[PDB]
Design a binder for this molecule. Sequence first.
Ligand SMILES: *[C@@H]1O[C@@H](C)[C@@H](O)[C@@H](O[C@@H]2O[C@H](CO)[C@@H](O)[C@H](O)[C@H]2O)[C@@H]1O
Ligand SMILES: *[C@H]1O[C@H](CO)[C@@H](O)[C@H](O)[C@@H]1O
Ligand SMILES: *[C@H]1O[C@H](CO)[C@@H](O)[C@H](O)[C@@H]1O
Length: 44
Amino acid sequence: AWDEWSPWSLCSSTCGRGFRDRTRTCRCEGPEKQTKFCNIALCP
Ligand SMILES: *[C@@H]1O[C@@H](C)[C@@H](O)[C@@H](O[C@@H]2O[C@H](CO)[C@@H](O)[C@H](O)[C@H]2O)[C@@H]1O
Ligand SMILES: *[C@H]1O[C@H](CO)[C@@H](O)[C@H](O)[C@@H]1O
Ligand SMILES: *[C@H]1O[C@H](CO)[C@@H](O)[C@H](O)[C@@H]1O
């Protein structure tokens, strides 16, 4: 009843803590989003 999750997004921050998200749609109530922590670099 679900499409595949999208790829995880880039980190919302280019340094320091941020969020990454992905989403899936029905193809089943409605769309779903998953969110996680990310940190790709220390800020200067
Ligand atoms: C993405 O690239 C990084 C290397 C930094 O230049 C980022 O800028 C910094 O972003 C943070 C918020 O994530 C701000 O607190 C700083 O002011 C800023 O230098 C950039 O967005
Ligand atoms: C998304 O989540 C996982 C892949 O990370 C699987 O359960 C499936 O592909 C779903 O669409
Ligand atoms: C999110 O997580 C895996 C593990 O890195 C990624 O490779 C993929 O893009 C998925 O969206």
